[PDB]
Write a protein that binds this ligand. Structure first.
Ligand SMILES: O=C(O)c1ccccc1O
Ligand SMILES: [Cl-]
Ligand SMILES: [Cu+]
Ligand code: NA
Length: 370
């Protein structure tokens, strides 16, 4: 099964006592089937209580989704400073090359963010550039010659050796309660909101889901409605399947989805046709917290919640503009927009009987699972 990337298969670019980054392999290293998603990476960042990330920029465009906890993100640009508060299920776009850091200000709970990265240059390559730090993480200022740094900073070499030579604790480090309180104060300060500014986070569970029943909900932030997604042609979806529920089988017309488990457990089945006559392989598996599943566009799929909790999933939708979900069963489904004769011809069954079978399910979207 090339579609399922267990959390264990993720690579760990850094790990400290205060945090870690896990990132998926370039999808094209797994399979040539993934040439369509070559520009994209998925990562998980975790911060321990009272932690701070050394300032750095990512060369890729980034979307962060808060999976667990609470915190702050700050952004330092040439001509602007931002602070935003991050809560569970908030989503935040960070422009490529923006210098950022995070703070987990909570004393007890980890802050866990799931990350989509879209490359701009070579497909799928993603790198952090530590402006902060010194020895570990290595600051990029150490790449420049001393004669250059001295002129640039108008300072003697010995002050610069001290400046870039004392950080050794790695990319995520402890911050004191007091340091945190002071950053919290700077973050709560009112600013002048301009046009052209980086936009703050939006809650994915805000307002009305795109569809629901008693057994689940699908929320989505589409690129049509969110300018900070529009230029990447990305949608962010949130699937909340009630304990013991399922989503009815469906396909996305246009948009391949990179699906990460937030909470709970489940399983899935997908149909995949990837000259003799077309055959659809059964792609099947289980899902745990932190797993990634690639759901290619046009592929029929169902997710089943298993265990004693809801199955909660976030999906990064690519090529998302005008995407729709075609449901394959339930009251509201594609066959409602097919007339009798075509049902009859299609299944070689008298048409009224096809209608009867297709209308037995009075519920839509989500139902009691097997
Ligand atoms: O949009 C999807 O098909 C999807 C599926 C599972 C989880 C989140 C999602 O956005
Ligand atoms: Cl017939
Ligand atoms: Cu396929
Ligand atoms: Na017929």
């Amino acid at each position: 099964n090339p579609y399922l990337f267990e959390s264990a298969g993720f690579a760990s670019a850094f790990r400290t006592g205060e945090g870690h980054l896990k990132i998926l392999e370039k999808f094209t290293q797994r399979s040539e089937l993934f040439r369509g998603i070559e520009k994209y990476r998925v990562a998980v960042l975790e911060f321990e209580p009272q932690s701070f990330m050394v300032p750095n920029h990512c060369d890729g465009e980034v979307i962060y989704v808060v999976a667990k906890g609470a915190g702050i993100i700050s952004i330092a640009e040439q001509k602007a400073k931002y602070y935003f508060v991050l809560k569970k299920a908030d989503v935040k776009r960070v422009p490529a090359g923006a210098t950022i850091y995070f703070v987990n200000r909570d004393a007890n709970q980890k802050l866990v963010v799931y990350v989509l990265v879209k490359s701009t240059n070579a497909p799928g390559e993603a790198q952090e550039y530590f402006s902060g730090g010194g020895q570990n993480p290595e600051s990029f200022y150490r790449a420049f010659s001393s004669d250059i740094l001295e002129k640039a900073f108008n300072t003697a070499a010995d002050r610069l050796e001290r400046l870039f030579g004392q950080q050794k604790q790695g990319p995520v480090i402890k911050a004191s309660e007091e340091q945190i309180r002071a950053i919290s104060q700077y973050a709560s300060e009112p600013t002048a909101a301009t046009g052209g500014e980086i936009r703050g986070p939006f809650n994915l569970l805000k307002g009305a889901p795109l569809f629901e029943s008693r057994f689940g909900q699908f929320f989505e932030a589409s690129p049509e409605l969110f300018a900070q997604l529009r230029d990447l042609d990305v949608a962010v979806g949130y699937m909340n399947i009630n304990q013991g529920g399922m989503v009815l089988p469906y396909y996305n017309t246009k948009s391949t989805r990179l699906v990460m488990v937030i909470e709970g457990n489940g399983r899935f089945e997908m149909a995949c046709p990837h000259a003799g006559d077309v055959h659809y392989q059964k792609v099947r598996g289980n899902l745990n917290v932190g797993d990634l599943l690639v759901v290619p566009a046009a592929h029929p799929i169902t997710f089943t919640a298993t265990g004693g909790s809801n199955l909660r999933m976030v999906g990064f939708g690519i090529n998302a503009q005008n995407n729709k979900k075609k449901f394959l069963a339930g009251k509201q489904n594609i066959w409602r927009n097919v007339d009798r004769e075509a049902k009859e011809l299609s299944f070689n069954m008298p048409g009224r009987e096809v209608e009867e079978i297709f209308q037995k399910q009075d519920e839509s979207y989500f139902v009691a699972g097997p």
